[PDB]
Ligand binder design. Structure first.
Ligand SMILES: CCCCn1c(Cc2ccc3c(c2)OCO3)nc2c(N)nc(F)nc21
Length: 208
């Protein structure tokens, strides 16, 4: 059974802004998702220093980027702390609300979209290149869950009966028809070299 939630109005407004505004530098969506993955891996690495059983769901700390041109998808896979249902439904919405006012306020005054990360809300950049995102995530104290959003001001959560994932988050970007460049290898590599070269954890770019 699928549950359907409305986004806070502010969120739904920022998703509309990112989907409507004309801005060509779409490629920063990647370094936002990787930086998010980086923060998540850093959390589980810290938590584990005082409670070693934390990495029973998996010791390896890495990011994968996985492009599939048959599915039209780019997947940003991490083995970080993951996300609870509470996070999905309630708390990321709660954290983001302040983030969105600030960003929005900075944008007249002439800051830009590439600066979204500075405000705690770069997840939403995905919607620069993805017509839907699906997020698969598993945190230790909790089940694995599938959140999905085509914007539209609603998002779903379900329990995921899919391939169990141990601990972490998969960001499945279902790309817009004209965004397929983000499935080439030479594309993904340049962007990672440019904006993500110093991430303290291995990033393996899969080929097809
Ligand atoms: C806002 C920072 C925390 C949430 N978060 C984010 C940003 C984010 C914000 C809002 C989101 C979302 C993801 O999926 C659904 O809605 N990425 C994460 C990740 N890879 N791993 C963990 F452990 N947490 C993540």
């Amino acid at each position: 059974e699928v549950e359907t939630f409305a986004f806070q109005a502010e969120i739904a407004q920022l998703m509309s802004l990112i989907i409507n505004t004309f801005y060509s530098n779409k490629e920063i969506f990647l370094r936002e998702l990787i930086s998010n993955s980086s923060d998540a891996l850093d959390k589980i690495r810290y938590e584990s220093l005082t409670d070693p059983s934390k990495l029973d769901s998996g010791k390896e700390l890495h990011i994968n980027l996985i492009p599939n041109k048959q599915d039209r998808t780019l997947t940003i896979v991490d083995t970080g702390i993951g996300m609870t249902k509470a996070d999905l439904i309630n708390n990321l919405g709660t954290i983001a609300k302040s983030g969105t006012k600030a960003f929005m306020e900075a944008l007249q005054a002439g800051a830009d979209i590439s600066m979204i990360g500075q405000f705690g809300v770069g997840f939403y950049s995905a919607y620069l290149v993805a017509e839907k995102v699906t997020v698969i995530t598993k945190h230790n104290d909790d089940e694995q869950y599938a959140w999905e959003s085509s914007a539209g001001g609603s998002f779903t959560v379900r329990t995921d009966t899919g391939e169990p994932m141990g601990r972490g988050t998969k960001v499945i970007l279902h790309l817009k028809e004209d965004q397929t460049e983000y499935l080439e290898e030479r594309r993904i590599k340049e962007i990672v070299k440019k904006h993500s070269q110093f991430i303290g954890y291995p990033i393996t770019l899969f080929v097809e």
